[PDB]
Ligand binder design. Structure first.
Ligand SMILES: O=C(O)[C@H](O)[C@@H](O)[C@H](O)CO
Length: 310
């Protein structure tokens, strides 16, 4: 029971980012599983707007499928803000375990009340600081930097607490803000820095890996609910296949991006062991400060699940 259907899948990252390629993979699997009857059309590079607009399009029904970072979802469901706390996940194995386990599912289960289906989590990844003002290799080097952040109170409060002038902006405005130096820098995974070309306007890169961002792979509930069960199964089966593809592509992409940026002579710094402890000390009270704006039980449950996975 599958009828011909065209499905629009907009997203913010470049079409040749790992997640852009995973979106094309999803399209291919949907076509395969539906004998070519269900056709997914991908619109990358922010062609259908940034995350905030994509979310709204799924709620309204103008769009069917997207992936977005968890951070803009915090404007609908504050508990999703948990992932903007620094150093939550020691590595990607911990992340997968927590996200695919009960603590991840509790959050996904809050989406339908807002008109969204969280099909599963994809990997945005560990975020790294870039800027055009000066090298950042110490906590103090962040003071007064105008740093674009994602658009929720947790991200703004974290970087303000680290001394930055935190400037929330949609991802789709970011390259130009960097190029014109309306902001000094930003922070994102290496493959995004590469495929969105931020290195062309960001001479400095710090391998801070300070935050891990999940993507949520999303379907419009209004749209999903009017699918037949056979068609829903195509979507959920393709989503499971594509998650595995995505995560592998993301992790290979992270390795490839580091190699590329280094070989391109981007200037790369890190936080020494001492500076790392300074950052940990400064973060701990702002993390505690933000539990009330995320949800105490969410923060503590994610932290406990991460400990058990680590
Ligand atoms: O910096 C950001 O906003 C995120 O990292 C991106 O992936 C964003 O979701 C994209 O569309």
């Amino acid at each position: 029971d599958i009828k011909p259907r065209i499905i629009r899948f907009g997203y913010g990252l470049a079409d040749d980012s790992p997640t852009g390629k995973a979106s094309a993979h999803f399209a291919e699997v949907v076509s395969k599983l539906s004998d070519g009857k269900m056709k997914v059309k991908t619109f990358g590079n922010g062609a259908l707007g940034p995350d905030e607009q994509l979310i709204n399009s799924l709620i309204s029904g103008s769009g069917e499928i997207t992936f977005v970072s968890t951070a803009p979802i915090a404007s609908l469901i504050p508990e999703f803000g948990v992932f903007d706390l620094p150093f939550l996940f020691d590595n990607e194995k911990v992340a997968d375990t927590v996200l695919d386990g009960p603590e991840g599912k509790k959050l996904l289960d809050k989406l339908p009340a807002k008109g969204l289906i969280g099909l599963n989590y994809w990997e945005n990844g560990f975020r790294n600081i870039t800027n055009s003002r000066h090298e950042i290799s110490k906590l103090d080097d962040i003071g007064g930097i105008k740093l674009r952040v994602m658009q929720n109170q947790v991200a703004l409060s974290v970087f303000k607490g680290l001394g930055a002038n935190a400037i929330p902006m949609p991802f789709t405005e970011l390259f130009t803000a960097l190029e014109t130096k309306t902001v000094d820098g930003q922070e994102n995974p290496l493959s995004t820095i590469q495929t969105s070309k931020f290195y062309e306007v960001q001479p400095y890169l710090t391998l801070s890996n300070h935050v891990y961002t999940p993507f949520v792979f999303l379907a419009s509930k209004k749209w999903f609910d009017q699918l037949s069960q056979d068609e829903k199964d195509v979507i959920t089966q393709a989503a499971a296949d594509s998650q595995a593809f995505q995560r592998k592509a993301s992790r290979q992409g992270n390795e490839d991006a580091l190699k590329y940026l280094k070989e391109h002579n981007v200037k790369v710094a890190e936080f020494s062991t001492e500076e790392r402890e300074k950052i940990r000390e400064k973060v701990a009270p702002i993390v505690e400060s933000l539990k009330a704006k995320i949800g105490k039980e969410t923060v503590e449950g994610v932290l406990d699940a991460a400990k058990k996975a680590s």
